[PDB]
Each structure stands twice: as C-alpha cells, then as structure tokens.
Design a binder for this molecule. Structure first.
Ligand SMILES: *[C@@H]1O[C@H](CO)[C@@H](O)[C@H](O)[C@H]1NC(C)=O
Ligand SMILES: *[C@@H]1O[C@H](CO)[C@@H](O)[C@H](O)[C@H]1NC(C)=O
Ligand SMILES: *[C@@H]1O[C@H](CO)[C@@H](O)[C@H](O)[C@H]1NC(C)=O
Ligand SMILES: *[C@@H]1O[C@H](CO)[C@@H](O)[C@H](O)[C@H]1NC(C)=O
Ligand SMILES: *[C@@H]1O[C@H](CO)[C@@H](O)[C@H](O)[C@H]1NC(C)=O
Lengths: 235, 48, 229, 48, 46
C-alpha cells in the first residue's frame, strides 16, 4: 500500500503474500474503496487464506468499473482480466498527489489495442490489418502501449486511481495466511467448539489413524463435511 | 451445492455477511427440505 | 513420429482433501485412458517443439538423468514471457523471464546453463527448492488453469521386457507445487543434458473428462475408470 | 416461468449477466425438478 | 444523449429509436450511472 513506485496496468505486478498474519484492519484505517467479491469485507479477519496475491496497477477513475467479474471494456479485455469466480477484494483509491505531473506521466502506460481478448489472471508484456507494420508505424498500425499523460488539473474520472486486487482461495489447501486471532490450547476426547484454520464446527476431536499426505490438510466425508483436520501448530 | 457457493454451512456464515448468507442458506434449507420430503414420500410408497 | 499407448496412467489427485474408502466422481482435465501418446527416443536428435493443448502429461524413462527440465512459452522467444525448469545436482530452478532460447537448448555440454537461454527481460519469478528428479520412470502432469501452474509428480522405477514401453499399472500422481506464473503456455519443449547414454520420454495431452476415482483405505487412489471411454 | 422473467432458458442467458441469471435459472431448475418430482411421485402411486 | 437543452421532467421528451443498428458502447463514453432493469448493460449489443 505505502509504496511510491507502483506498476503500469498492462504489466501489473502480482505480489505473493504468505506465512504471515494479515491485519486487514490497517487498510480500513486508510479515503479508499473496499468492494469485495466472494468474501464480504467485514468477515476477512476471522478467516485463513491459502495464498494472498496482490495485483497492483494504476488506472483512471472511470475504468475502476471495468475491473469486475463478467465485465467487458478496454482495461478488462486488453490489460487486466478478472475471473468470474475468484475470491478477493478490489481496492481503489485516488492518488493524484503522487501520480500526476504538469507535463505528464510516461511511467504508466496501457495497452490500447490487442489481437484477441485476454484470459483471466494473465499478463501480456509484449497490426490492425491490411499492410503489415514490420516494426514501424504505418497504415492500420498502432503502438499498442499508449501513455496515460496524467495531470492534476484533470477531472476526477480521469484522475490517477491506484487499484490493488487481493485474491485468495479458501478451504482448499494448507493456509499460509491467517487472521490475527489468538490461539487456544488443544484438548482431545471432549465435545468442544473448534476453529481450525478458519473452519468452525462443534465436535469431539480424537487422534486419527488416517495418514494425510503433506498436500492434504482436511479429510472429507461422503456428505462433504470435514471428518478429520490436521492441527496447524502441531501436525 | 444446491445452487450455493458451498455445501457446508459454517463457511457460508464465516465467508459471507449475515444478510448475504440468509440468501444462500435459505436455498440450502429449501433443497435439503425438498430432498427430505422426497425421502418421506418414497418411504411412504415403499411402506404401502 | 512413433506412437505408444497410455494404459491407465495420467491420474492425479484432483484436490488437497483426504478421502478414504470412497468412489468419488470428478470432472477435470485428465489424460484419457487407453490414449495414443507421442514417444521420443534419443541416444540427429529428437528435441522438438510441442503444443500445450490445455494440459500435458509428461513421462520419462531414463537412467543417467538426461532429461533435466522443460521450457514453456507462447512463441518461445524474447518478445513474450516464458517459463523455464532447470534441474541439476543441487536443486531445481523454476524461473519465469522473457528468455531468448536457442534452437537446441541442450543443457551443459559442466557448461552450466549454456545455450538454454541467451537473455532475460522483465524476469518476475524465481522458485528454487528441492530438485524434482536400471531405469527410473518419472511422471509429470502440467496444468495451466486461471494463471496457476499445477505440477503433479510421481517417481516409481519400472522393468523392461519389450524395450522402452509405458508400464501397464495404476499409479496416482501426488500434487508437487502450485505456481502463480500468470503467463500464456501455448507451446513447450523439453531439455536434454548432452555430454554413452540413452533416454526416452512420453508426451500426452489432457482432455476434460469425468473420472470415477477409487479411494480406499490409506487414502490412496488405486483405481479409476474413464466415464467417456 | 416459476417467478423468473421468462419460461425459456435462452433469453435469460442472453439478457441477464451471469450472477443474476444463476438465481433466475436456479428458480426455474428448482421448479422444474418439483414438477418432475410430482410426476414421478404420481407415477409411483399409480404404479402401486 | 447530447442536447443544448434537455426537456424538463414535467414534460419529458420521448424520442422513438427504430430501423437502425444500436451500439450501446458509445453511451459509456460521456461519472456515469447506468442502472438496467430486466437486462444487464454488457448483453445489450447481443
Ligand atoms: C495465448 O496466445 C495465443 C497465441 O496464438 C493467443 O492466440 C491467445 O489469445 C492467448 N490465449 C490466452 C490463453 O490468453
Ligand atoms: C510453531 O509451529 C511449529 C510448526 O511447524 C512447531 O513445530 C513449533 O513447536 C511451534 N512453536 C511454538 C512456540 O508454538
Ligand atoms: C495408435 O497408433 C497405432 C500405431 O501408430 C495405431 O495402430 C492405432 O490405430 C492408433 N490408435 C488410434 C486410436 O488412432
Ligand atoms: C546447481 O544450480 C544452482 C542454481 O544456480 C547453483 O547454485 C549450484 O552451484 C549448481 N550446482 C552444481 C553446478 O553442482
Ligand atoms: C494400508 O496400510 C496398511 C498398514 O497398516 C497396509 O498393511 C496395507 O497394505 C495398505 N493398503 C494398501 C492398499 O496399500
């Protein structure tokens, strides 16, 4: 969040976040929009995520609506495409005090044209027709990467907005990311409410003969209800 | 899944906000009540 | 090109949730059972370019660890992003740069990376971990789903009888690593560590098929049937 | 229509966006399953 | 969409649009509110 140097939308940088507690409360303290899909925003703290990926880029204020599931546009189809069924938050905030100059901003660009629509969670860092361009500008030829040329005197819909997309998966892997929740000592052979890695249930916990392979973290019954769990603190 | 995001109930409670969940878990309750009514109808026919 | 038969191979664990004594039906990208797969044998040299086609099952039978790694990419040059897998005696290097590959990316002759890549532009990835790799059968399944690279691996030595044949047995492939590569893997090429040796490797393409996997006790997939076979 | 905007599937997929359709087509699917459960129940009773 | 003087709410102007091919991408060109009932915005060009 508090970085002076971000990334252009066509070459967005995705940051792996793992093996740490993430206090989403700090982001809420920071002028900001916190629209979330798959998880509602308030419930993020009491959850454990498999891996947290931050997709950081700079767009205009009217192109924030293009960063959406099932949305077609310039930025959505040619720069940064979102899946229809991801689990994560989109965070957009205005930063025209750090990303606008009087002459313009040639640090951040966008791919204006492309041959085909771009598949979700993919990045393209690379001719309309008639004559071939052959590496030079000509008829029906364009330099796809065009500059945003930001200014502080522009309108609010054209002001530089810094968008980070926090994507994660839930209850499908051993969770490297967890909320800042204090641990509780484990007792067995007792009826106790349990919250293992963001899974809440009331049950009697006993030693299990099942040998989970390292990838396996949970055991599922024929009703798809967890029948065994591997304790995170002690395996 | 019965047209919901997951079959388990405690994820839908933890992952989604209370107004948003009451849409998913109402679907789940309707689907499970339909399946249970199908089981008490077929068991009544088998009992006859 | 020579073609051989995959008798029951290509079955991996679809998810990281134990299941035991359960016949579970999953619809995912798997290798169709009894499928014709390409067989390349090297002792000219057979190091060709092959398409990905939304999933690659790779199996290799070798002794001297000649087949070290693979490359993945769209056009396999420096204008587009590409992946690399390089294995040596210490570790494995999975590295996603904008490599300028040579036409024959033979590893080492040691001469180290040598002619596998010439230049690296906008390199964004570098996962280094424990290395991935009488005859030893090493099986790999590559999936590129929503920008995530999934590798499923299984190592089990096999016998000869008829020379260089895939074995008739059921062995489930355990998930090994999941990578957020975020590139377009359209084509791929294996790497051969040229130095008296022999190697042979098998390439099969996955298809979206429904598989009924036979989980038993100890949680191992021991049998499976292709629904549309 | 079972409370949806239309009886047929294709205009609900062409008109509404995927999140909104998954509720409307779930309402159609549940109702069609109910009609087909009513038919199977009445066929079981007449078969008895 | 572009008029020197829009009509007042009490006497709203109703323009009949027919016998033409309508592209709804141009509308988004002009802070835009686009709430659609019975249909979604992306599906209009289909
Ligand atoms: C990947 O590259 C191919 C090259 O032919 C291109 O046509 C396609 O649009 C790209 N597809 C994906 C998966 O983004
Ligand atoms: C922390 O967790 C690890 C799990 O690998 C465990 O081995 C270790 O004993 C734990 N340490 C404390 C202080 O709980
Ligand atoms: C597979 O290849 C063999 C020999 O190349 C051929 O006899 C056989 O018919 C092929 N199978 C199919 C399904 O094409
Ligand atoms: C194996 O590769 C690693 C990665 O660069 C290197 O540090 C190491 O020295 C290599 N080991 C050899 C060449 O024996
Ligand atoms: C399961 O584990 C037991 C060890 O108690 C072993 O005897 C048995 O052979 C195993 N089953 C299979 C199918 O490997």
């Amino acid at each position: 969040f508090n970085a002076t140097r971000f990334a252009s939308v066509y070459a967005w940088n995705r940051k792996r976040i793992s093996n740490c507690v993430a206090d989403y409360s700090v982001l809420y303290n920071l002028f900001f929009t916190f629209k979330c899909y798959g998880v509602s925003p308030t419930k993020l703290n009491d959850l454990c995520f498999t891996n947290v990926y931050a997709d950081s880029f700079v767009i205009r204020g009217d192109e924030v609506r293009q960063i959406a599931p099932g949305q077609t546009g310039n930025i959505a189809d040619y720069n940064y495409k979102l899946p229809d069924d991801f689990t994560g938050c989109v965070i957009a905030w205005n930063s025209n005090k750090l990303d606008s100059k009087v002459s313009g901003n040639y640090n951040y660009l966008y791919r204006l044209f492309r041959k085909s629509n771009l598949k979700p969670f993919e990045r393209d860092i690379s001719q309309a027709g008639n004559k071939p361009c052959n590496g030079v500008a000509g008829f029906n030829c364009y330099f796809p990467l065009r500059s945003y040329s930001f200014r502080p005197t522009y309108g609010v819909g054209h002001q530089p907005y810094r968008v980070v997309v926090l994507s994660f998966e839930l209850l499908h892997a051993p969770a490297t990311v967890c909320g800042p929740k204090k641990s509780t000592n484990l007792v067995k052979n007792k009826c106790v409410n349990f919250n293992f890695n963001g899974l809440k249930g009331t049950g009697v916990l006993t030693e299990s003969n099942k040998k989970f392979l390292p990838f396996q973290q949970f055991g599922r019954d024929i009703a798809d209800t967890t029948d065994a769990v591997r304790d995170p603190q002690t395996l | 899944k019965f047209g919901a995001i997951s079959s388990v109930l405690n994820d839908i409670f933890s992952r989604l906000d209370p107004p948003e969940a009451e849409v998913q878990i109402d679907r789940l309750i309707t689907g499970r009540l339909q399946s249970l009514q199908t089981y008490v109808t077929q068991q009544l026919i088998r009992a006859a | 090109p020579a073609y051989t038969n995959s008798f029951t191979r290509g079955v991996y664990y679809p998810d990281k949730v134990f299941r035991s004594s359960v016949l579970h039906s999953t619809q995912d990208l798997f290798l169709p059972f009894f499928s014709n797969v390409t067989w390349f044998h090297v002792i000219r040299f057979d190091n060709p370019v092959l398409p990905f086609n939304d999933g690659v099952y790779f199996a290799s039978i070798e002794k001297s660890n000649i087949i070290r790694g693979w490359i993945f990419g769209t056009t396999l040059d420096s204008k587009t992003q590409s992946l690399l897998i390089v294995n040596n005696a210490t570790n494995v290097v999975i590295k996603v740069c904008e490599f300028q590959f040579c036409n024959d990316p033979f590893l080492d002759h040691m001469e180290s990376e040598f002619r596998v890549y010439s230049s690296a532009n906008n390199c964004t990835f570098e996962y280094v971990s424990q290395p991935f790799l009488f005859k030893n059968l090493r099986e790999f399944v590559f999936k590129n789903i929503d920008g995530y690279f999934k590798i499923y691996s299984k190592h089990t030595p096999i016998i000869v009888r008829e020379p260089e044949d895939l074995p008739q047995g059921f062995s489930a492939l355990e998930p090994l690593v999941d990578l957020p590569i975020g590139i377009n893997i359209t084509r791929f090429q294996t790497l051969l560590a040229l130095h008296a040796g022999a190697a042979a490797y098998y390439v099969g393409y996955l298809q979206p098929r429904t598989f009924l996997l036979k989980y038993n006790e100890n949680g191992t997939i021991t049998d499976a049937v292709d629904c549309a076979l």
